[PDB]
């Protein structure tokens, strides 16, 4: 349940990273912004690097999501955080 909602957030981070790669493929750079939909359980953010060659997607749990993995992140290299024990997507 709580676990299920963590995996939901992971699935959305991944869908979002796939969209970012489509923009990168057409433009050679990541975009300045990306509209993301928050939930009662996670707040999502997209942060490109200054040179727009990298990014970080984050899902930050709300107080209503008492999950041991805390904030989840996913970058332009596919690196998932927390690095162990937490990601299944």
TrEMBL record:
It comes from the Bacteria. Disulfide bonds join 69-86. Keywords: Membrane, Transmembrane, Transmembrane helix. Signal peptide: none annotated. GO terms for biological process: type IV pilus assembly. This is PilD processed protein. It comes from Shewanella oneidensis (strain ATCC 700550 / JCM 31522 / CIP 106686 / LMG 19005 / NCIMB 14063 / MR-1). The lineage of its organism: Bacteria, Pseudomonadati, Pseudomonadota, Gammaproteobacteria, Alteromonadales. The chain holds residues 36 to 123 of 123 of the full protein.
